[PDB]
Design an enzyme around this catalytic site. Structure first.
Site, mmCIF file in Angstrom:
data_model
loop_
_atom_site.group_PDB
_atom_site.id
_atom_site.type_symbol
_atom_site.label_atom_id
_atom_site.label_comp_id
_atom_site.label_asym_id
_atom_site.label_seq_id
_atom_site.Cartn_x
_atom_site.Cartn_y
_atom_site.Cartn_z
ATOM 1 N N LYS A 145 1.083 3.727 -2.231
ATOM 2 C CA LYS A 145 0.469 4.976 -2.663
ATOM 3 C C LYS A 145 1.461 5.843 -3.447
ATOM 4 O O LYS A 145 1.699 7.017 -3.149
ATOM 5 C CB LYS A 145 -0.140 5.766 -1.489
ATOM 6 C CG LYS A 145 -1.167 4.960 -0.714
ATOM 7 C CD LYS A 145 -2.003 5.865 0.195
ATOM 8 C CE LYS A 145 -3.206 5.117 0.768
ATOM 9 N NZ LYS A 145 -4.014 6.010 1.590
ATOM 10 N N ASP B 153 4.223 10.326 -7.366
ATOM 11 C CA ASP B 153 5.282 11.214 -7.878
ATOM 12 C C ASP B 153 5.244 11.165 -9.400
ATOM 13 O O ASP B 153 4.379 10.483 -10.001
ATOM 14 C CB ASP B 153 6.626 10.807 -7.267
ATOM 15 C CG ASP B 153 7.613 11.945 -7.059
ATOM 16 O OD1 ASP B 153 7.762 12.789 -7.980
ATOM 17 O OD2 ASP B 153 8.291 11.943 -6.008
ATOM 18 N N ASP C 290 0.862 -1.206 0.000
ATOM 19 C CA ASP C 290 0.000 0.000 0.000
ATOM 20 C C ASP C 290 0.888 1.243 0.000
ATOM 21 O O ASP C 290 0.797 2.079 0.904
ATOM 22 C CB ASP C 290 -0.913 -0.087 1.215
ATOM 23 C CG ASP C 290 -2.023 0.931 1.287
ATOM 24 O OD1 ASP C 290 -2.428 1.448 0.237
ATOM 25 O OD2 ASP C 290 -2.529 1.140 2.406
HETATM 26 O O1 LIG Z 1 8.136 17.062 -4.799
HETATM 27 C C1 LIG Z 1 8.914 17.241 -5.791
HETATM 28 O O2 LIG Z 1 10.069 17.708 -5.694
HETATM 29 C C2 LIG Z 1 8.344 17.054 -7.159
HETATM 30 C C3 LIG Z 1 7.060 17.531 -7.418
HETATM 31 C C4 LIG Z 1 6.653 17.735 -8.731
HETATM 32 O O3 LIG Z 1 5.569 18.304 -9.013
HETATM 33 N N1 LIG Z 1 7.485 17.420 -9.754
HETATM 34 C C5 LIG Z 1 8.706 16.893 -9.557
HETATM 35 O O4 LIG Z 1 9.430 16.665 -10.548
HETATM 36 N N2 LIG Z 1 9.158 16.631 -8.257
HETATM 37 C C6 LIG Z 1 10.433 15.918 -8.004
HETATM 38 O O5 LIG Z 1 11.517 16.782 -8.370
HETATM 39 C C7 LIG Z 1 12.470 16.066 -9.180
HETATM 40 C C8 LIG Z 1 12.465 16.531 -10.631
HETATM 41 O O6 LIG Z 1 13.689 16.050 -11.164
HETATM 42 P P1 LIG Z 1 14.140 16.436 -12.658
HETATM 43 O O7 LIG Z 1 12.976 16.301 -13.633
HETATM 44 O O8 LIG Z 1 15.259 15.456 -12.913
HETATM 45 O O9 LIG Z 1 14.694 17.848 -12.599
HETATM 46 C C9 LIG Z 1 12.132 14.583 -9.049
HETATM 47 O O10 LIG Z 1 12.874 13.990 -7.963
HETATM 48 C C10 LIG Z 1 10.658 14.578 -8.726
HETATM 49 O O11 LIG Z 1 10.356 13.459 -7.883
HETATM 50 O O1 LIG Z 2 -4.822 2.294 0.496
HETATM 51 C C1 LIG Z 2 -5.364 1.968 1.592
HETATM 52 O O2 LIG Z 2 -5.439 0.782 1.967
HETATM 53 C C2 LIG Z 2 -6.010 3.041 2.412
HETATM 54 C C3 LIG Z 2 -6.761 4.013 1.755
HETATM 55 C C4 LIG Z 2 -7.663 4.791 2.471
HETATM 56 O O3 LIG Z 2 -8.499 5.523 1.892
HETATM 57 N N1 LIG Z 2 -7.804 4.614 3.799
HETATM 58 C C5 LIG Z 2 -7.066 3.739 4.493
HETATM 59 O O4 LIG Z 2 -7.276 3.614 5.719
HETATM 60 N N2 LIG Z 2 -6.078 2.968 3.843
HETATM 61 C C6 LIG Z 2 -5.131 2.097 4.585
HETATM 62 O O5 LIG Z 2 -5.857 0.980 5.124
HETATM 63 C C7 LIG Z 2 -5.524 0.754 6.500
HETATM 64 C C8 LIG Z 2 -6.670 1.143 7.423
HETATM 65 O O6 LIG Z 2 -6.390 0.490 8.644
HETATM 66 P P1 LIG Z 2 -7.394 0.550 9.896
HETATM 67 O O7 LIG Z 2 -7.968 1.937 10.103
HETATM 68 O O8 LIG Z 2 -6.526 0.097 11.039
HETATM 69 O O9 LIG Z 2 -8.467 -0.497 9.626
HETATM 70 C C9 LIG Z 2 -4.286 1.596 6.778
HETATM 71 O O10 LIG Z 2 -3.080 0.818 6.611
HETATM 72 C C10 LIG Z 2 -4.356 2.710 5.758
HETATM 73 O O11 LIG Z 2 -3.030 3.106 5.381
#
Ligand SMILES: O=C(O)c1cc(=O)[nH]c(=O)n1[C@@H]1O[C@H](COP(=O)(O)O)[C@@H](O)[C@H]1O
Ligand SMILES: O=C(O)c1cc(=O)[nH]c(=O)n1[C@@H]1O[C@H](COP(=O)(O)O)[C@@H](O)[C@H]1O
Lengths: 256, 256
Positions: A91, A94, A89
């Site tokens: 998620k 990026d 999980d």
């Molecule tokens: O949170 C971030 O820095 C991020 C947000 C976003 O909107 N776009 C984005 O490119 N980034 C991050 O910033 C970096 C961009 O890298 P370059 O495309 O190589 O310059 C990567 O590590 C992405 O994971």
């Molecule tokens: O992707 C998921 O499983 C997730 C999505 C979401 O909308 N809500 C959510 O609770 N989860 C995940 O599902 C689990 C919920 O756990 P409990 O609240 O303990 O039953 C956690 O590990 C969360 O990270």
């Protein structure tokens, strides 16, 4: 409406979805255990004891204090023995170029052991394209987060519709959703719903609960994801059986 | 409009934001290096050589093949020596109860070494509440992702406004934004902008680039985040200097 076993045979079914639907039907379980523990020994003891009761074990590998790839090898042994999928999980949320590395590499090597991962749709479809470049060759599947269980979730209206479109346009890799309900009308897609407990309530950090009967029976989802409702109980096997029987009967009664 | 040095003294400034703004002014840098490498040795050699040129080094700890906490100790030594912040670009995006564990625990212990982390706002404000329960006691700061550089981003309109409200309501912990532009009118908040290169273009997985002059000068952001524009260049020190001089002059010219 088709049974899980019939959905496993649909023309457009993904192999990972088919495997899951077949073992759901065989074992009479649509329960995903959310194994939200910090110790490898507790993760593996829960996987072994609850394996027969679950279709899927959901991990957060990044909260496991003593993660090693060997722990994941032992989890796969249990998944094969008891017949359940492993869902990390993570998620992913990026840009495509970054998530490909986060999925394949680093210390976790998630793609090497996770049947399923999930992604947020907010970055646009590049998140799916990046993951699918690693996941397609490794025969993996992905879930898109269309709705969230938490208070103030912005995954509503047009956002949810965008998640469904992105899934239905990437069906070679995307096999379903994290959602609170049926969001796709296409039966090839899985709906997995977290925020599930038998009793009304929530937590102190925005989690909201609904019952298995509500989310499977009334809202039309396929699988319940349950963490604390099982993990915090004294007898986690009996708790898993309670949740399994609730989710399974809600599914049967929707079928007629 | 105030200089970085004057913003560092604002009444409502967060201590992490103040530390950053003071070293930006002292060193004449508003460049954040995106250290998107898989080898600890390359991460540390870049941090040492480029440290004088940067206000911040952004990590993705989960793509490091040879991560250990001792690597992060060595990175902190370089951050203290050369005066830059460490920003782990983890994009927390789960329920509050989960992200608290992902931030404090597991293998990475992110909160132990990262001055800054970031979060998506899509789960609602519980994501911030969960992080802040680890981060406040550890004197850390957080950035909220208000806009995204990637094609098909859904972080627009009401979503961006929700991110700004969530930041401005959690100012004890949230110190700014990942954004493409100035999104908050409150000068206490930092704007950091990725998707930056000197030349027009993009990548094959939805990344889109704009220039330092565009994002700092025309769009009013504070800091450029640059990965491949530096990392893929032969001489990464000269590349960092070109990005630093571009972003710094764009900032000065908006100041007048
Ligand atoms: O949170 C971030 O820095 C991020 C947000 C976003 O909107 N776009 C984005 O490119 N980034 C991050 O910033 C970096 C961009 O890298 P370059 O495309 O190589 O310059 C990567 O590590 C992405 O994971
Ligand atoms: O992707 C998921 O499983 C997730 C999505 C979401 O909308 N809500 C959510 O609770 N989860 C995940 O599902 C689990 C919920 O756990 P409990 O609240 O303990 O039953 C956690 O590990 C969360 O990270």
């Amino acid at each position: 409406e088709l049974s899980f076993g019939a959905r496993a045979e649909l023309p457009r079914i993904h192999p990972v979805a088919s495997k899951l639907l077949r073992l759901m039907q065989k074992k009479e379980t649509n329960l995903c255990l959310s194994a939200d523990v910090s110790l490898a020994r507790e993760l593996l003891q829960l996987a072994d004891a609850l394996g027969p009761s679950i279709c899927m074990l959901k991990t957060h590998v990044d909260i496991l204090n003593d993660f090693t790839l060997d722990v994941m090898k032992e989890l796969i042994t249990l998944a094969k023995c008891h017949e359940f999928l492993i869902f990390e999980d993570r998620k992913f949320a990026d840009i495509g170029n970054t998530v490909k590395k986060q999925y394949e590499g680093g210390i976790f090597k998630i793609a090497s052991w996770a049947d399923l991962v999930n992604a947020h749709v907010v970055p646009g479809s590049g998140v799916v394209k990046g993951l699918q470049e690693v996941g397609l060759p490794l025969h993996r599947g992905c879930l898109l987060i269309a709705e969230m269980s938490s208070t103030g979730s912005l995954a509503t209206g047009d956002y949810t519709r965008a998640a469904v479109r992105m899934a239905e346009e990437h069906s070679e890799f995307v096999v379903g959703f994290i959602s609170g309900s049926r969001v796709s009308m296409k039966p090839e897609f899985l709906h997995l719903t977290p925020g599930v407990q038998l009793e009304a309530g929530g937590d102190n950090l925005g989690q909201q609960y609904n019952s298995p009967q509500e989310v499977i029976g009334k809202r039309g989802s396929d699988i319940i994801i349950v963490g604390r409702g099982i993990i915090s109980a004294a007898d986690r096997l009996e708790a898993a059986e309670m949740y399994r029987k609730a989710a399974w009967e809600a599914y049967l009664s929707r079928l007629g």
